[PDB]
Amino acid sequence: SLAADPVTVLGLGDMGSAIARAFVERGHRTTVWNRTASKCRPLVEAGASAAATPDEAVEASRFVVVCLLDSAAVDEVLGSVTSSLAGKVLVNLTSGSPSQARSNERWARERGAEYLDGKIMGDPPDVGTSNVSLSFSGSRSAFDAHEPILRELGGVAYHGEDAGLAAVEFLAQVAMGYELLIGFLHTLSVVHAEGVEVEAFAERVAGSVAAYPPLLTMMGKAIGSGEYGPDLGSLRVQAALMDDLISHRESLGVEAVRMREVKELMDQRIADGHGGQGFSSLFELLT
């Protein structure tokens, strides 16, 4: 007679085990399943119950959380289900594409189940703390009714009705990080060719990057409204600076793919009569 809802967790990898542990510690009657059945033993010792098949696992609860390796693993496990999922809520926290999340929603709807797609930012040891954040998309009614359960895993945010929006958010944020990181490596190449110690320079880059979040928010506001101004100076001033940037790094034998790309966009926007605007206005040339 516990006030916590029963929960089923499919998948006991590092993340899935941490999610199952969080539910067990919160008093939920937790039923777990894993392709390798032996991985259930530590969860059972913590207070969970094990299931031999995914069918037995989903039959134990209305709330089913899927945390497997990838989308192919989700298709195989859910495809082995022969029991009714009508009236259940399926929360998929497995990595995957926006198209796959949208397909999963249709698969659940055909079976009478509600569907939420979630994406996790953080490490399994931090599940249930403020160092893990989760993005969700799908039916708003399903999110609102189960948000207190989801926030037991960490910080939670809802992105919209489109079931693929959480996957869009995840892939876009990760891509942005790799844009930053590869530009970081190429910048280290420039200073290394000049005899600068890269380790100390990297720490100085870290301090410079910390001042950019306020600039990114402002650029998003200018793009969303269409009011473009000289953010980092006029485009005429920035374009002349870009040529100096390209000449210096190329004189050292270092690549300049993004620097030359930015210069071409700046020159086009200036030629279009918008030389007094700023960097954010280059978005009009991309989309």
Torsion angle, alpha carbons of 81, 83, 86, 91, to 10: -40
Q: CA-CA distance, 111 to 105, in Å (whole number)? A: 10
Distance between CA atoms of residues 28 and 149, nearest Å: 10
CA angle at residue 213 from 211 to 215, to 5 degrees? 80
| CA nearest to 190, candidates 203, 178, 202 | 202
My answer on whether 243 and 203 are in the same domain is: yes
Q: Which of 100, 127, 160 is the last residue of a domain?
A: 160
Domain span holding position 109: 1-160
32 and 21 share one domain: yes
At which of 160, 182, 208 does a domain end? 160
Same domain membership, residue 211 and residue 76: no
DSSP codes, the chain: --SSPPEEEE--SHHHHHHHHHHHHTT--EEEE-SSGGGGHHHHHHT-EE-SSHHHHHTT-SEEEE--SSHHHHHHHHHT--S--TT-EEEE-S---HHHHHHHHHHHHHTT-EEEEEEEES-GGGTTSTT-EEEEEE-HHHHHHHHHHHTTSSEEEE--SSTTHHHHHHHHHHHHHHHHHHHHHHHHHHHHHTT--HHHHHHHHHHHHTTSHHHHHHHHHHHHH-----BTB-HHHHHHHHHHHHHHHHHTT---HHHHHHHHHHHHHHHTT-TTS-GGGGHHHH-
Radius of gyration of the chain (CA): 24
- Residue 104 neighbours by CB under 8 Å, 6+ apart: 74, 90, 92, 96, 115, 117, 163
Domain check: are 136 and 202 in the same one?
A: no
Cα(243)–Cα(56) distance, integer angstroms:
65
Backbone angles phi, psi at 156, to 5 degrees: -135, 140
Distance CA 246, CA 101 (A): 42
Report how this structure was experimentally obtained.
X-ray
Residues 20 and 40 in one domain: yes
User: How far is CA 122 from each of CA 14, 68, 132, rounded to the nearest angstrom?
Assistant: 12, 16, 5
Neighbour tally for 239: CB within 10 Å: 20
Q: What DSSP assignment string belongs to 149-175?
A: HHTTSSEEEE--SSTTHHHHHHHHHHH
Clarify whether residues 155 and 183 are in a common domain: no
CA-to-CA distance for 96 and 170, rounded, in angstroms?
9
Domain end: 129, 160, 191, which one?
A: 160
CA dist., res. 10 & res. 56, Å (int) = 11
What's the reported resolution, in angstroms, to a tenth?
Answer: 1.6
CATH number of the domain bearing residue 141: 3.40.50.720
Both 144 and 221 in one domain: the answer is no
Question: Helices 71-79 & 98-110, crossing angle to 10 degrees?
Answer: 10
Cα angle at 110 between 105 and 116, to 5 degrees?
Answer: 25
Give which of 123, 119, 141 is closest to 131, Cα–Cα: 123
- Using an 8 Å Cβ cutoff, are 15 and 120 in contact? yes
User: How many domains in the chain?
Assistant: 2
Please tell me the distance from the alpha carbon of residue 210 to that of residue 212, in angstroms, as a whole number.
6
